[PDB]
């Protein structure tokens, strides 16, 4: 079911019913009451985390913020100061929602003489581990929590007693919740939450209902994109097999909400173009042919597409036509001609590809810093984020678009993260560049690269608390694209059927 005839078919028959929407809106009001209803503070924290874990955060963002704000009041601070499980859980949720909590909050639990956590509970270890990924640079206490809890959970996993709990452990060790793509995890979590003892039936049922309703929107989107892809004719080309569906899966990680379907579809279209144009430069095109493709894009002039061969001219024209349509959409819906920006990100995209082509053909071995300045662009994420900004920013202007295209720290941090995350999972790449600069071993070099991921994430985390020109949903896209990269890096086919095709049985 990587076959396009199947995909084009989607959107014809939807599983959801008029009854399900009414029940969903009934359940939604009840969950809002529960989110806002009185509750013990630690219990509220698990429920709110459970709501976020299920992917319902978009539905109850405001109720969640009031609830956390109210828990941060001067009255009754006694319940979480003494025990680490509440202190860790409270620290993460407050930080995730914009309420600052200092790292010194964990000093009580730390041993003063040793400086390491008192060896003196699995959930206690788990909450500490997840919370450590919400840390900023220089918050050394959190770094200690990270290394300690990882080592303890790996040791404790062998003696794990509960089967549902045992799964939860292995999953957290694979990727912390902070780094997991929201839509894919919600599907996984629905099965895990259900079996959890203290599980709430009303929330689970609403979570199941909401997951199914959102999936139908995805199915229609997949159908249009599939029909659009065959229409381009790139589907019959040798490169980018199943390129559209993989690219769509990436857009799901960045944004999954139905109200952003038009933006998501345009993003999926660009990714499919991104995958295919990448292959033309990496494999099919000859270097003499590629300079023309890049030059045509820099000029945004198609007079010589005839000179280029068909197996290359069609992707170039699909990219030319697709950027103009997306730019036009901005002019139609947003009152702003977006063609200069889509052309610019496509121009730099190829220029970035050519530079990598230059290094591999000249036997160059770049330094990690040298390699990353280009690789952050070639992963193409500047193109995807700037495009996402154009289609969603309120009252767009030349001034706003130029700033985002300049790659400020918040956007740039996300871009650098994706290139390194992609490298770790799969010319010489980022591990080899490190190996050439230091001669280090494959595992140690790999260990250092894993370190950069954590550093940039800290930078990404601190940026969310700083004043910024960006607002939702661009802020979420920047964090979410990084989570999506973690998700993609065979096995991707299994996640697709589970999230996009198969409905949750009721």
DSSP 402-444: HHHHT--HHHHHHHHHHHHHHHHH----HHHHHHHHH---HHH
C-alpha to C-alpha distance for 9 and 285, rounded to whole angstroms: 33
Q: Enter the tokens of residue 241.
A: 């097999």
How many other CB atoms are there within 10 angstroms of residue 388's CB atom? 27
Contact between 346 and 323 under an 8 Å Cβ cutoff? The reply is yes
Q: Enter the tokens of residue 1.
A: 């079911």
Contact between 304 and 292 under an 8 Å Cβ cutoff? The reply is yes
C-alpha to C-alpha distance for 221 and 286, rounded to whole angstroms: 35
Binding site listing for Mg(2+): 278, 282, 356
How many other CB atoms are there within 10 angstroms of residue 102's CB atom? 10
The CB-side HSE value for 172 (13 A sphere, CA atoms) comes to: 27
Contact between 366 and 434 under an 8 Å Cβ cutoff? The reply is no
Binding site listing: 278, 282, 356
Q: Kindly give the residue spans of alpha helices, DSSP state H, lying in 74-139.
A: 78-81, 84-96, 122-131
- 209 alpha-carbon distance from chain centroid: 23
**Phi, psi angles (nearest 5°) of residue 478:** -65, -45
Way it was determined: X-ray
Q: Tokens 């300045």 identify what position?
A: 373
Q: Enter the tokens of residue 214.
A: 């959102």
C-alpha to C-alpha distance for 254 and 480, rounded to whole angstroms: 5
Under DSSP, the state recorded for 134 is G
Give the total residue count for the chain. Answer: 506
- 386 alpha-carbon distance from chain centroid: 15
Q: What is the resolution of this structure in A?
A: 3.1
Long-range contacts of 163-172 (CB under 8 A, 24+ apart): 164/192, 164/195, 164/196, 165/122, 167/192, 168/126, 168/192, 169/122, 169/126, 172/126, 172/129, 172/130
Quick check: helix, strand or coil at residue 199? coil
SS3 content of the chain, % helix, strand, coil (to 5): 75, 0, 25
The CB-side HSE value for 57 (13 A sphere, CA atoms) comes to: 18
C-alpha to C-alpha distance for 43 and 299, rounded to whole angstroms: 60
C-alpha to C-alpha distance for 105 and 12, rounded to whole angstroms: 54
The CB-side HSE value for 131 (13 A sphere, CA atoms) comes to: 31
Residue 181 burial (CB < 10 Å; 0-12/13-18/19+)?
buried
| Cα 465 to Cα 95, 96, 473, distances in angstroms | 9, 10, 15
Query: Which run of H or of E encompasses 372?
Result: helix 368-378
C-alpha to C-alpha distance for 64 and 52, rounded to whole angstroms: 9
If you compute the radius of gyration of the chain from its CA atoms, what whole number of angstroms results? Answer: 24
C-alpha to C-alpha distance for 286 and 254, rounded to whole angstroms: 33
Q: Kindly give the residue spans of alpha helices, DSSP state H, lying in 198-309.
A: 201-232, 243-254, 261-279, 287-299
CA angle 199, 205, 207 (to 5 degrees): 90
Contact between 478 and 410 under an 8 Å Cβ cutoff? The reply is yes
């Amino acid at each position: 079911l990587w076959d396009y005839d199947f995909l084009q078919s989607l959107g014809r028959h939807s599983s959801v019913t008029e009854e399900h929407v009414g029940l969903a809106e009934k359940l939604k009001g009840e969950v809002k009451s529960l989110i806002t209803g009185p509750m013990e503070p630690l219990a509220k924290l698990e429920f709110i985390d459970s709501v976020r874990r299920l992917g319902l955060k978009y539905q109850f963002e405001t109720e969640m913020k009031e609830a956390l704000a109210n828990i941060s009041k001067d009255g009754y601070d006694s319940w979480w100061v003494d025990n680490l499980r509440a202190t860790a859980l409270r620290f993460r949720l407050l930080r995730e929602n914009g309420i600052f909590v200092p790292q010194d909050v964990f000093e009580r639990f730390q041993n003063k003489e040793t400086g390491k956590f008192k060896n003196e509970d699995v959930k206690k270890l788990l909450n500490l581990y997840e919370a450590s990924f919400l840390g900023w640079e220089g918050e050394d206490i959190l770094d200690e929590a990270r290394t300690f809890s990882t080592a303890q959970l790996k040791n404790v996993e062998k003696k794990i007693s509960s089967p549902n709990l045992a799964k939860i452990v292995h999953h957290a060790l694979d990727l912390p919740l902070h780094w997991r793509a929201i839509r894919y995890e919600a599907r996984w979590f629905i099965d895990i939450y259900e079996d959890e003892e203290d599980m709430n039936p009303t929330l689970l049922k609403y979570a199941k209902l909401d997951f199914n309703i959102v999936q139908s929107f995805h199915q229609a989107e997949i159908g249009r994109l599939a029909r659009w892809w065959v229409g381009t004719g790139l589907d019959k080309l040798p490169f980018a097999r199943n390129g559209l569906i993989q690219s769509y899966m990436y857009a799901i990680g960045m944004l999954f909400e139905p109200h952003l379907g038009e933006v998501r579809e345009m993003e999926a279209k660009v990714g499919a173009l991104i995958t295919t144009i990448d292959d033309v430069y990496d494999v099919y095109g000859t270097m003499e042919e590629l300079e023309l493709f890049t030059d045509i894009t820099e000029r945004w002039d198609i007079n010589r597409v005839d000179q280029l061969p068909r197996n290359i001219r069609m992707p170039l024209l699909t990219m030319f036509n697709t950027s103009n349509d997306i730019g036009y959409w901005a002019l139609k819906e947003r009152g702003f001609n977006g063609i200069p920006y889509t052309a610019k990100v496509w121009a730099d995209q190829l220029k970035s590809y050519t530079k990598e082509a230059k290094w591999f053909h000249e036997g160059h071995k770049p330094t990690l810093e040298e390699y990353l300045e280009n690789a952050l662009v070639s992963i193409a994420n500047p193109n995807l984020l700037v495009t996402s900004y154009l289609l969603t920013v309120d009252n767009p202007t030349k001034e706003k678009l130029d700033y985002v295209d300049s790659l400020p720290l918040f956007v740039r941090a996300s871009c650098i993260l994706c290139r390194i995350i992609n490298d770790l999972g799969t010319n010489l790449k980022s591990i080899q560049c490190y190996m050439n600069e230091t001669g280090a071993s494959q595992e140690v070099a790999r260990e250092h690269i894993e370190g950069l991921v954590r550093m940039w994430w800290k930078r990404l985390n601190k940026c969310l608390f700083e004043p910024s020109p960006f607002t939702e949903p661009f802020l979420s896209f920047t964090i979410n694209v990084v989570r999506g990269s973690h998700f993609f890096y065979s096995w991707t086919k299994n996640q697709g059927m589970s999230v996009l095709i198969h409905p949750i049985t009721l």
